[PDB]
């Protein structure tokens, strides 16, 4: 029931460049129930950030998010080699969950 | 004693959140006793510091004149108190608690200074 | 630790039924954990089918009378397994299917909220095409 | 049309936490004094009338294998045992050459009251305690002369386990599942909050559980990693089976002075007839319970033919059934109990006869594995008899692959004795502070 | 410090129950010190819980609007405060204390809810 | 947390004396922990006894209607709050503190009795 | 313990300069301690000249451009010393000079208050005459 | 912990010679202490659980323990320390024995 | 005890072993 979109759809960056990944939801999520996903080409994604800006055990400290009402931004400081790939932000406060089209990083 | 009506609706909890309220009345076991008593005293003192510092002091249903920006929550009264329980609400506002406490303290000191200076 | 492996890839025909079994290695029980089924269309955003959370099957709005969720807990030799059953398949269902599992033991962890939840662990995926 | 912050104190909100739980015993003392190992004293809070409070429509996840209450109890067990046996006879002048001949008549040079004198002492030592080190008289030594010194239990300390209650301090609570056929992991249907756990007796046993709490309608098999064969399997009892263990071998203990206040008690000649210790098992009831246990295991094991084999690895504490009757440790075998095949041909064998199992009593007790202090149990004057009603078994699954699963007895750590009884409880802390928006505008 | 004028009439006790009021300012002995201090803290905290829970909080002569059914006592003011002392009165109402405390708590929460809802 | 703006003027201290205020949230080391916790509890309880006994209870800037005889001090407002700091003032009135506390307690009980008797 | 010894007595002429050195025995530092110079006229009330309190020289209203205060802290052999220097001496300056030292470590002791302070220790005095 | 800009000599009774003198370092000097004397320790049972560990024969070559001090840095630091002590000691010739 | 020695020295002494009766020579 939440139509969530993320911009820019495509972007390009090199190693060591801070990258802005943001997605404005259709409705405000006051509970910070947003999850960030990073899918490598071929295999499955993994969960990086949950509950707005909370890290997961076994994640590099370069993935930090923000929760400001409807705006949710993901930051990649000192972009690393494996970080290249599509990204997804998902809301899990209202049944059912919804993802975005996909933001990818290219050289 | 406060565990009663935990899963009930918020209205039933409120009418129950005051139904029990509180009835009150070298050895390793002695060490455990002392640790438990000191811990309970510390928790009670912490709660009383927060209550008295917000101006509540010894009142159960404590009022405050702090506004409710649609940033901590955006739902309306009836759904908060019917489509929810106390634990659900606490999880909803889990990481806004520090900001809310700070705003309560600032509002309390503001109103206290205002009344002291208007007392002339 | 937590490893999710599921069945292989195969090609079927429209109107048939597909059974995809997801084996959960390292998951103690499906009572504490919850398994969620999500589908990613080829070169397209993901989609959520349904879940069986503490033995409670559910499905998305579009998947009414269309998908069935099964789950089996710990056994003597086999690990806990959850199976995906879809019937009356059409040409639009050709996509990779993912099996996702997350822990719901802690209510303050933030991974779950009233049944809708994040996906901590993921499977390798099953390519499906006609 | 706008909301204002309203502070609530006393909201029903709890969060997982671990704290120190104290002791709560049913008020004794009119039992004379009788300082038991689990000191009744310093358990000052006498449990009042239980204060129950059921929580409606509350579903709380439970995980018996990550509970901190078991570790609470285990550390308290070890600490209490050390505290109990510490302040009396040290008994260090015992590791010598034993010029021995079950049991053996052994002679050794023992230190008497004075430093100058030396006395020759003849004592009876069980073969389990004796260790070897073209003749007719051999020379021996004790079982644990390389691990630690041997220490007497203590003159007036009783080994009777009494129920112990575990309350939490103010600001904390315990959630009890109260769910029938609870597997120990997963959500609980309805939950009630209590202060102390039910009266639990700290009995110590291996490979076969002892006095405890029964089930509600069926047999519950609970194990952390049922798939894994290296994790012990715990079985709860629908119904209990009574066993009778006795030592009709009347002793005449005699105390000798081995130092200034060091009184050593040794086993004298057995007056009257000589008898060996045994335990009686009701054959029909035991076989019925074992059949029900196998039937309930079959569903967990893909309806395979369950077969029970006796213990294989030779290890005196592990292969035996450990327990104390009145201060004496028996260590019988359970081979005549755990030897049957269930479901292979669906038909019977069994019989219905009372089962008598031989026992090998010893006195040196290296219990709590190597963590606990070594103990010497003084002999008891009269005959020994205690009536026990079994509630639980500790099974172990065997690496090869076949259509039948072999479950041999023998548990793991001592925590498994109480894991069957602390599964339903879970300590939790409560935060009474709560903030909700209303239309108040004041204060 | 409150032991003064213990055997005096209730009026003299009341005028004296505020005359002292309160002036304030591994070893076995250390263990005794710690036990005594913790016990004193617990008693003070218990008294303050009861006072604040009845709405008294930090007031010595605390008022309440609870009626006085002729079941706890049937004597009239002058004889209560002249034909009696504080210990005699406490013995008279010894086993009604729990009921009286419960009624005080119920009355307090009732009046607090009433004022909160009339605050509109 | 109260150490901030210690050397500042009294006005700056007053506007700061409420800026932090309070954010809150057998082994020899365990013995030290227990001693420290009990000592902190005792100091907090002492301060709260004095505050509640003067009628302040849970208020930071507590008012009182006690006069100011030119015996504890003879300087006038502006110089007290500009030519001075909090430590200087405490040293100035160091050995009048007991008398001032006693007078506060007497005034509190006087006003409480007066209001109770006027409540008719 | 605390012993204050200073220079001897001598006679000088008007218009000259007098240097009186006060040696502090038992005083650790002049940072924690403070030395005060007071003069007692023959058969007359005392008078306060000035001080050097934690390395801050000062003097009375009448002693402006007239008196100088010096102080040296602990050395290898000599104890802390403070010297009194007065110039343009006249016939009214003939009086005994006292060296006074007090401890300022504790603020609640009451011996000191915002620089003006009591004199806990005293020296033997130096008679001065023309 | 190092100092901030210079050498600090702190002593309770600098005049008294019976009180130790403590010197703080402007900058630190690294030292290397090693025992290239490979041991073969062996434990013997001297009681019920009493295990006594004794030094066995030194296998390989035999060496004596030593510590290495950077001569230039140590001498510079000592010279700075002496210079800062001279002012406290009336500019006397500081000698270390 | 008395150390029947010969830096370091090779010393021999009578040491109490596992048992009270026996005695071991330790270098
Ligand atoms: C401890 O303890 C505890 C307790 O006791 C435990 O728990 C447990 O657990 C267990 C496990 O182990 C479990 O069991 C499981 O369960 C699950 C679930 O179930 C659920 O669900 C289901 C489903 O639902 C759905 O569907 C339906 C129909 O269609 C509907 O109606 C509904 O509504 C839903 O729907 C929804 O959703 C969807 C999606 O999904 C959508 O789409 C829609 O729209 C909607 O929305 C169901 O069915 C169920 O039900 C049942 O049950 C109930 C109760 O619960 C009842 O009431 C009912 O009635 C029913 O019953 C019936 O049936 C039965 C059968 O048998 C019978 O008997 C009876 O009589 C009746 O008739 C529920 O609700 C499930 O799933 C599972 O199942 C499985 O298994 C079994 C055996 O066991 C079998 O039989 C089956 O069949 C299955 O199997 C399958 O799968 C597998 C996997 O892999 C495989 O292998 C096989 O082969 C199979 O497959 C096949 O078949 C299928 C069929 O379908 C197909 O599809 C395929 O393809 C193939 O062919 C089980 O059962 C339980 O539950 C629990 N409980 C509790 C209380 O919790 C625990 O675990 C323990 N622990 C330990 C450690 O031990
Ligand atoms: C640890 O650490 C710490 C830290 O580091 C330390 O502390 C330290 O200590 C030290 C000691 O050791 C010290 O030092 C010292 O100091 C002192 C003080 O000073 C101050 O004061 C002064 C005075 O003032 C006054 O005066 C002036 C002029 O006139 C004026 O201006 C002022 O204002 C004042 O006046 C006022 O008052 C008066 C009275 O008195 C009145 O009358 C009036 O009116 C007014 O009111 C001064 O001068 C000074 O100043 C200086 O310094 C500063 C800084 O501080 C500066 O800024 C300045 O500028 C100056 O400087 C200058 O000079 C110098 C010199 O050198 C040079 O260098 C430079 O460059 C410049 O130019 C101050 O403020 C003092 O006094 C002292 O002195 C002494 O010593 C020295 C050496 O060291 C010398 O040089 C000198 O001279 C002196 O000596 C003298 O004395 C002695 C005694 O005995 C003798 O012996 C000798 O011989 C001499 O005598 C002579 O000379 C004199 C001259 O005057 C004459 O008079 C006589 O007669 C003879 O002839 C010292 O310096 C320091 O300060 C401190 N610091 C701190 C930071 O604190 C501690 O100690 C340690 N500890 C341990 C244990 O180690
Ligand atoms: C309760 O007890 C049970 C049994 O004792 C225990 O189950 C065991 O769980 C572990 C989980 O770690 C399982 O180990 C994994 O098994 C999977 C599946 O292997 C299957 O296929 C092989 C080959 O055909 C068979 O030999 C095997 O028997 C299975 O049928 C493996 O895929 C896993 O591989 C990982 O480990 C490798 C080292 O062995 C590493 O190289 C690597 O980390 C592998 O993971 C990698 O795989 C991805 C590709 O798929 C790769 O892209 C990633 O980078 C990823 O890192 C692993 O061996 C073990 O088999 C289970 N045992 C049994 C008998 O089933 C439970 O874990 C236990 N519960 C708890 C809570 O402890
Ligand atoms: C599972 O639960 C069952 C519950 O029935 C339990 O069986 C019971 O065990 C207890 C503990 O041993 C037994 O109680 C003991 O009984 C003996 C025998 O007394 C007989 O004779 C008297 C008098 O004729 C009868 O009244 C009685 O019914 C018996 O027929 C007693 O001698 C024991 O006394 C000890 O406890 C006293 C307090 O009750 C203390 O004063 C003192 O500790 C006594 O021991 C002391 O005696 C020595 C002198 O002999 C003294 O020198 C020592 O200092 C020593 O401390 C005690 O009352 C009870 O009879 C059992 N009940 C049945 C039906 O058999 C199982 O043991 C339990 N399972 C396990 C594994 O423990
Ligand atoms: C809504 O409210 C929730 C309340 O929990 C907030 O969730 C917390 O968010 C914070 C900050 O994002 C999390 O803190 C971070 O946790 C990371 C995970 O660490 C795990 O693993 C280690 C090692 O095994 C464990 O010790 C630890 O307990 C965890 O299990 C850490 O890696 C992070 O460390 C980072 O910070 C340190 C400095 O502290 C730096 O050195 C590095 O940058 C390092 O990367 C960090 O501590 C916290 O875990 C979350 N809690 C939960 C329960 O999830 C949400 O953030 C909040 N919403 C918003 C939008 O703020
Ligand atoms: C909730 O669990 C409690 C267990 O504590 C159940 O209460 C028991 O109910 C039976 C019959 O209903 C009584 O005979 C017992 O005396 C009750 N026990 C207690 C401790 O009160 C209760 O039935 C459960 N509720 C539901 C809806 O299943
Ligand atoms: C437990 O007691 C039984 C009773 O005999 C023992 O069973 C016999 O053990 C011997 C040697 O261990 C074998 O030779 C016999 O064949 C066994 N008899 C049967 C019927 O199997 C058993 O060994 C004892 N266990 C231990 C550890 O001593
Ligand atoms: C031994 O087991 C028996 C059977 O489970 C227990 O006997 C019952 O005990 C309860 C309360 O303890 C009584 O209400 C029943 O009437 C008893 N039944 C019989 C047949 O005696 C006995 O309590 C158990 N012993 C111990 C020590 O727990
Ligand atoms: C609500 O919270 C946001 C988050 O910081 C804050 O910026 C805003 O000012 C708050 N609302 C009001 C009315 O101040
Ligand atoms: C022991 O040796 C033999 C073998 O048992 C036996 O006949 C003999 O009587 C015993 N005593 C002696 C002294 O040999
Ligand atoms: C084991 O259980 C399954 C499910 O109830 C049943 O179908 C099967 O027949 C059982 N096995 C045997 C041997 O009866
Ligand atoms: C007085 O106490 C009795 C005893 O329970 C109670 O029934 C009665 O209601 C009380 N009086 C009033 C006015 O309620
Ligand atoms: C001020 O203090 C003095 C000192 O005891 C006291 O006598 C006087 O009464 C006080 N002032 C007033 C107005 O009471
Ligand atoms: C020691 O220091 C004083 C003061 O700076 C100086 O006058 C004197 O010359 C110095 N001593 C030497 C030997 O230089």
GROMACS .gro file of N, CA and C and ligand atoms in nm, chain D residues 201 211-212 214 240 242 389, ligand 8:
model
   49
  558UNK      N    1   1.381  -2.932   4.360
  558UNK     CA    2   1.478  -2.999   4.445
  558UNK      C    3   1.606  -3.024   4.367
  568UNK      N    4   1.366  -3.733   4.125
  568UNK     CA    5   1.256  -3.652   4.178
  568UNK      C    6   1.244  -3.518   4.107
  569UNK      N    7   1.124  -3.486   4.059
  569UNK     CA    8   1.104  -3.363   3.987
  569UNK      C    9   0.958  -3.332   3.959
  571UNK      N   10   0.626  -3.352   3.695
  571UNK     CA   11   0.570  -3.435   3.589
  571UNK      C   12   0.523  -3.349   3.473
  597UNK      N   13   0.520  -4.088   3.620
  597UNK     CA   14   0.643  -4.128   3.688
  597UNK      C   15   0.638  -4.275   3.727
  599UNK      N   16   0.807  -4.545   4.005
  599UNK     CA   17   0.875  -4.549   4.134
  599UNK      C   18   0.983  -4.657   4.133
  746UNK      N   19   1.095  -4.168   4.252
  746UNK     CA   20   0.989  -4.180   4.152
  746UNK      C   21   1.034  -4.107   4.025
 1302LIG     C1   22   0.634  -3.952   4.373
 1302LIG     O1   23   0.548  -3.970   4.261
 1302LIG     C2   24   0.412  -3.984   4.305
 1302LIG     C3   25   0.328  -4.006   4.181
 1302LIG     O2   26   0.355  -3.905   4.085
 1302LIG     C4   27   0.364  -3.863   4.388
 1302LIG     O3   28   0.243  -3.900   4.454
 1302LIG     C5   29   0.139  -3.800   4.443
 1302LIG     O4   30   0.174  -3.676   4.506
 1302LIG     C6   31   0.073  -3.574   4.493
 1302LIG     C7   32   0.128  -3.450   4.559
 1302LIG     O5   33   0.265  -3.466   4.592
 1302LIG     C8   34  -0.058  -3.622   4.557
 1302LIG     O6   35  -0.159  -3.524   4.534
 1302LIG     C9   36  -0.101  -3.755   4.499
 1302LIG     O7   37  -0.215  -3.805   4.569
 1302LIG    C10   38   0.012  -3.857   4.508
 1302LIG     N1   39  -0.026  -3.983   4.448
 1302LIG    C11   40   0.009  -4.101   4.499
 1302LIG    C12   41  -0.038  -4.222   4.424
 1302LIG     O8   42   0.076  -4.110   4.601
 1302LIG    C13   43   0.465  -3.823   4.494
 1302LIG     O9   44   0.434  -3.694   4.545
 1302LIG    C14   45   0.605  -3.820   4.436
 1302LIG     N2   46   0.702  -3.791   4.539
 1302LIG    C15   47   0.770  -3.676   4.545
 1302LIG    C16   48   0.866  -3.662   4.659
 1302LIG    O10   49   0.753  -3.586   4.462
   0.00000   0.00000   0.00000
